[PDB]
Structure formats: structure tokens, C-alpha cells
Amino acid sequence: CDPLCSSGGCWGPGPGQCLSCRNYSRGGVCVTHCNFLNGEPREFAHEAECFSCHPECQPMEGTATCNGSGSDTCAQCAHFRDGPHCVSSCPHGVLGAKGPIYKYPDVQNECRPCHENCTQGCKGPELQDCL
Amino acid sequence: GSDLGKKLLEAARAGQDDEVRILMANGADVNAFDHNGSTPLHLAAAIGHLEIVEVLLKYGADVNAEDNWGNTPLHQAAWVGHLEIVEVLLKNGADVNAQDKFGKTAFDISIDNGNEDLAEILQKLN
């Protein structure tokens, strides 16, 4: 039995063949620990199971990269942030409750609203910033 | 394919054509959806990347997927006037008469927006 199995034993030699794990598991395979502070993908744990952080979370050094699976649970967005969600890009006319939403990224990479009259995109919040 | 699907959503969102191709060849879930129900095809249709739309449909994207509001990618492409994308979605089985939460079709949207080129394509293609 692999050292990572719990006292219950195993059905095979490797870490993927334990009846239960000593602590963490990733995809049913017993591991020493999740990728909390190092490694790819960065991970969080839920009930001793390792799950991946969202790919838009910035990998953190020395501290956790996320506490959940969503792009709204990152310690820091790798690229831009739209409300609570880390995204690769700000909305480019993606439909919402009232039609296409267009946003521009500010100095801090935070997606901010385009003027309501910017039927296409914008580079700022003013009507003269359309396109 | 789920971790890859999350990456696929962001590559389609940013119009990263080469990235979408690598992700699809690696088995990414083509029908993944984000915090708004937008699938990669909805995100590709919004920015106007016709090659991403064609790659997603080649890898089996659902042409009639709905976001959190009942919008299909045909509704998305029509709202932003992406004619070429509208023509490709229709050729790949998009329901031309699919209605949004206000009972409106891609044709109703094109008339509401003054897009006569779009309205004419919808009339001629169906």
C-alpha cells in the first residue's frame, strides 16, 4: 500500500488505488498536498480534495491563489476585472439583461462602462471616447 | 476538458484565435459557459472573430445554446451587426426564428437597430 493511503488499506500499489486517502486527493489520486503555494494549476481544497483555481487568477507567491473555483474568488486577477470576475478582456458587446455591454479597461485594469451612445466599443467613459 | 473549457471561454472572449485552436485540439469543452451563460460561440460572435466561430462549430459547438437570458449566438451576432457570422451560424443550423426574452428574432433586432443589410440577409437566406 502506498504511504498516502489511510489505515483502511488499498486494492493496488499506487496512490490511485487506496480505499481512502490519508489527507488530500486530486481526481481520486492520493497526494501529499494541493498546489496551494506552488505548482500548476494553482489549487484550493474542499473536504480534502484538490480543485483548480480559475485560469484568470494570478498565481501568488508564498500565499494562496484562490479560495474557490470561480473567477470571483482569486486573490488577484492576472489580466482585467469585470465586477467581481477576473477576465482576459472587458466586454465587447456581449449581451446582458438589456442588450450589448461594452466596457473599457482603466489604469488599474478594471472594466468600466462605455457611454450609452457608444454603439460600438470605447477607449474611455466620454461620448468622445467611442470607438 | 473542464479546466480547458474555462481557458477556452477566456481565449474566445479576448479573440485569441490561435489559442482557441490549440485549446480545441487539446479537447476543451466546446459548450462550456461563463458567469453570464455565454458559451465560447456567444463570446466569439460578440467580438466578430469569424474564424473562431467556424473552429468552434467544427469541434461541435451548440449553435442554439442559450445564455442566462435566452439569447442564442444568432441573437448575439445580429445585435452587433456581424453579418458574416450571422450567415455562418445559419448555414450550421441556427434557428432563424429563435426568440429572445422579448419574443424578438434576429430579424426583429436588425429592424430595431436600423440594419437593413442584416434584415435583407435574413429575408434572403430564409
Coordinates of C-alpha atoms in Angstrom, one line a residue:
Chain A
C1 CA 0.0 0.0 0.0
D2 CA 1.3 3.4 -1.0
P3 CA 2.2 5.6 2.1
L4 CA -0.5 8.1 1.1
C5 CA -3.4 5.6 1.7
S6 CA -5.3 5.7 5.0
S7 CA -5.2 2.8 7.6
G8 CA -8.1 1.1 5.6
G9 CA -5.7 -0.3 3.1
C10 CA -5.5 -0.4 -0.7
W11 CA -6.6 -2.5 -3.7
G12 CA -3.3 -1.8 -5.7
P13 CA 0.2 -0.4 -5.2
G14 CA -0.1 3.2 -6.4
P15 CA -1.6 6.3 -4.9
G16 CA -4.7 6.0 -7.2
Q17 CA -5.6 2.6 -5.6
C18 CA -6.3 3.4 -2.0
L19 CA -9.8 2.7 -0.5
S20 CA -9.4 6.3 1.1
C21 CA -6.6 8.9 1.4
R22 CA -4.5 9.9 4.4
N23 CA -5.5 13.5 3.7
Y24 CA -5.7 15.2 0.2
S25 CA -6.7 13.7 -3.2
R26 CA -6.7 15.1 -6.7
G27 CA -9.1 13.3 -9.1
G28 CA -9.3 10.4 -6.6
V29 CA -5.5 10.0 -6.6
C30 CA -3.8 10.4 -3.1
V31 CA -1.4 13.4 -2.9
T32 CA 0.8 14.9 -0.1
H33 CA -0.9 18.3 -0.6
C34 CA -2.7 20.5 -3.2
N35 CA -0.9 23.2 -5.2
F36 CA -1.6 25.8 -2.6
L37 CA 1.7 27.8 -2.6
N38 CA 3.4 26.4 -5.7
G39 CA 2.8 24.3 -8.8
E40 CA 0.4 24.4 -11.8
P41 CA -2.5 24.6 -11.8
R42 CA -2.8 26.5 -8.5
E43 CA -5.4 24.9 -6.3
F44 CA -7.8 25.3 -3.3
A45 CA -9.1 22.4 -1.2
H46 CA -12.7 21.4 -0.3
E47 CA -13.2 18.4 2.1
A48 CA -9.6 17.2 1.5
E49 CA -10.0 17.2 -2.3
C50 CA -7.9 19.4 -4.5
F51 CA -9.6 21.6 -7.2
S52 CA -8.1 24.0 -9.7
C53 CA -8.2 27.8 -9.3
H54 CA -9.8 29.7 -12.2
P55 CA -7.2 30.3 -15.0
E56 CA -7.7 34.1 -14.7
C57 CA -6.4 34.1 -11.1
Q58 CA -2.8 35.5 -10.9
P59 CA -0.6 32.7 -9.4
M60 CA 0.5 34.0 -6.0
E61 CA 4.0 33.6 -4.3
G62 CA 4.0 32.5 -0.7
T63 CA 0.2 32.8 -0.2
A64 CA -3.0 31.2 -1.7
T65 CA -4.1 31.9 -5.3
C66 CA -7.8 31.4 -4.8
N67 CA -10.3 30.0 -2.2
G68 CA -12.9 28.7 -4.8
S69 CA -13.3 27.5 -8.4
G70 CA -14.8 30.8 -9.7
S71 CA -13.0 33.8 -11.3
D72 CA -14.7 35.8 -8.4
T73 CA -12.5 34.0 -5.8
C74 CA -9.0 35.0 -6.9
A75 CA -6.5 36.8 -4.6
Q76 CA -5.6 38.9 -7.8
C77 CA -6.7 39.0 -11.4
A78 CA -4.0 38.1 -13.9
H79 CA -5.3 40.4 -16.6
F80 CA -8.6 42.5 -16.2
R81 CA -11.5 42.6 -13.7
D82 CA -15.2 43.0 -14.6
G83 CA -17.2 43.5 -11.4
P84 CA -16.2 40.5 -9.2
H85 CA -14.8 38.4 -12.1
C86 CA -11.3 38.1 -13.4
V87 CA -11.4 38.1 -17.2
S88 CA -8.9 38.1 -20.2
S89 CA -10.8 41.0 -21.7
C90 CA -13.5 43.6 -21.0
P91 CA -17.0 43.1 -22.6
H92 CA -17.0 43.8 -26.4
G93 CA -20.8 43.9 -26.9
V94 CA -21.6 40.6 -25.1
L95 CA -25.3 40.5 -24.4
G96 CA -26.6 41.3 -20.9
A97 CA -30.1 41.9 -19.4
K98 CA -30.6 45.0 -21.6
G99 CA -28.5 44.3 -24.8
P100 CA -24.8 44.5 -25.7
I101 CA -22.4 45.6 -22.9
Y102 CA -19.3 47.5 -23.9
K103 CA -16.6 48.4 -21.3
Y104 CA -13.0 49.8 -21.4
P105 CA -10.2 48.9 -19.1
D106 CA -8.9 51.7 -16.8
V107 CA -5.3 52.4 -15.4
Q108 CA -5.9 49.6 -12.8
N109 CA -7.2 47.1 -15.4
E110 CA -10.8 47.4 -14.0
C111 CA -13.5 47.2 -16.7
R112 CA -15.6 50.5 -16.7
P113 CA -18.7 51.3 -18.6
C114 CA -18.7 52.9 -22.1
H115 CA -21.0 55.8 -22.7
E116 CA -24.6 54.6 -23.5
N117 CA -24.2 56.1 -27.0
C118 CA -21.1 54.1 -27.9
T119 CA -23.0 51.6 -30.1
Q120 CA -19.6 50.0 -30.9
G121 CA -16.7 49.9 -28.3
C122 CA -14.9 52.7 -26.4
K123 CA -11.4 53.7 -25.0
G124 CA -12.9 55.9 -22.1
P125 CA -16.1 56.9 -20.4
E126 CA -17.0 60.0 -22.5
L127 CA -19.1 60.3 -25.6
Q128 CA -15.9 61.4 -27.5
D129 CA -14.2 58.2 -26.4
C130 CA -16.5 55.9 -28.6
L131 CA -14.6 53.5 -30.9
Chain B
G1 CA -11.9 19.1 -20.6
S2 CA -13.4 21.4 -17.9
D3 CA -10.2 23.3 -16.9
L4 CA -9.5 23.6 -20.7
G5 CA -13.1 24.8 -21.2
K6 CA -12.6 27.7 -18.7
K7 CA -9.5 28.7 -20.6
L8 CA -11.4 28.3 -23.9
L9 CA -14.0 30.8 -22.7
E10 CA -11.3 33.4 -22.0
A11 CA -9.5 32.8 -25.3
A12 CA -12.8 33.2 -27.2
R13 CA -13.6 36.3 -25.1
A14 CA -10.3 38.0 -26.0
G15 CA -10.3 37.0 -29.7
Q16 CA -7.2 34.8 -29.3
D17 CA -7.7 32.7 -32.5
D18 CA -4.5 30.6 -32.2
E19 CA -5.2 30.0 -28.6
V20 CA -8.8 28.7 -29.3
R21 CA -7.3 26.3 -32.0
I22 CA -4.7 24.9 -29.5
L23 CA -7.4 24.5 -26.8
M24 CA -9.9 22.7 -29.2
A25 CA -7.2 20.3 -30.4
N26 CA -6.5 19.5 -26.7
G27 CA -10.1 18.5 -26.1
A28 CA -11.5 21.7 -24.4
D29 CA -15.3 21.5 -23.7
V30 CA -16.8 23.5 -26.6
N31 CA -20.1 24.1 -24.8
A32 CA -18.6 25.5 -21.6
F33 CA -20.4 28.7 -20.3
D34 CA -19.3 31.6 -18.1
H35 CA -20.9 33.7 -15.2
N36 CA -23.4 35.0 -17.7
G37 CA -24.3 31.7 -19.6
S38 CA -22.3 32.9 -22.6
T39 CA -20.6 30.0 -24.4
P40 CA -17.4 30.4 -26.4
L41 CA -19.6 30.8 -29.6
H42 CA -21.5 33.7 -27.9
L43 CA -18.2 35.4 -27.0
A44 CA -16.7 34.8 -30.5
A45 CA -19.9 36.1 -32.1
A46 CA -19.8 39.3 -29.9
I47 CA -16.2 40.4 -30.9
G48 CA -16.7 39.4 -34.6
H49 CA -14.0 36.7 -34.9
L50 CA -15.4 34.7 -37.8
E51 CA -12.5 32.1 -37.7
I52 CA -13.1 31.3 -34.0
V53 CA -16.9 30.9 -34.8
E54 CA -16.0 28.4 -37.6
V55 CA -13.5 26.5 -35.4
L56 CA -16.0 26.1 -32.5
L57 CA -18.7 24.9 -34.9
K58 CA -16.2 22.4 -36.4
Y59 CA -15.5 21.0 -32.9
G60 CA -19.2 20.6 -32.3
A61 CA -20.4 23.8 -30.7
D62 CA -24.1 24.0 -30.0
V63 CA -25.3 26.6 -32.5
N64 CA -28.5 27.1 -30.4
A65 CA -27.0 27.4 -26.9
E66 CA -28.8 30.0 -24.8
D67 CA -27.2 32.4 -22.3
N68 CA -28.8 33.4 -18.9
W69 CA -31.4 35.5 -20.8
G70 CA -32.4 33.0 -23.6
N71 CA -30.1 34.6 -26.2
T72 CA -28.6 32.3 -28.9
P73 CA -25.4 33.2 -30.7
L74 CA -27.6 34.3 -33.7
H75 CA -29.2 36.9 -31.3
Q76 CA -25.6 37.9 -30.2
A77 CA -24.3 38.3 -33.9
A78 CA -27.4 40.2 -35.0
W79 CA -27.3 42.7 -32.1
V80 CA -23.8 43.8 -33.0
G81 CA -24.3 43.6 -36.8
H82 CA -21.9 40.8 -37.6
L83 CA -23.4 39.7 -40.9
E84 CA -20.8 37.2 -42.0
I85 CA -21.1 35.4 -38.6
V86 CA -25.0 35.5 -38.9
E87 CA -24.6 33.8 -42.4
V88 CA -22.2 31.1 -41.0
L89 CA -24.4 30.4 -37.9
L90 CA -27.5 29.9 -40.2
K91 CA -25.6 27.6 -42.6
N92 CA -24.7 25.5 -39.5
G93 CA -28.3 25.0 -38.3
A94 CA -29.1 28.1 -36.2
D95 CA -32.8 28.5 -35.7
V96 CA -33.5 31.8 -37.7
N97 CA -36.8 32.3 -35.8
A98 CA -35.4 31.7 -32.3
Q99 CA -37.0 34.4 -30.0
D100 CA -35.3 36.2 -27.1
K101 CA -37.0 37.2 -23.7
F102 CA -39.0 39.9 -25.5
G103 CA -40.3 37.5 -28.2
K104 CA -37.9 39.0 -30.8
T105 CA -36.0 37.2 -33.5
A106 CA -32.7 38.2 -35.2
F107 CA -34.8 39.9 -37.9
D108 CA -36.7 42.0 -35.3
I109 CA -33.4 43.0 -33.8
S110 CA -32.0 44.1 -37.1
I111 CA -35.1 46.2 -37.8
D112 CA -35.0 47.7 -34.3
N113 CA -31.3 48.7 -34.9
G114 CA -31.8 50.1 -38.5
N115 CA -29.6 47.4 -40.0
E116 CA -31.1 47.0 -43.5
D117 CA -28.2 44.9 -44.8
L118 CA -28.7 42.4 -41.9
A119 CA -32.5 42.4 -42.4
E120 CA -32.1 41.7 -46.1
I121 CA -29.7 38.7 -45.5
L122 CA -32.2 37.2 -43.0
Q123 CA -35.0 37.5 -45.6
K124 CA -32.9 36.1 -48.5
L125 CA -31.3 33.3 -46.5
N126 CA -34.7 32.1 -45.3

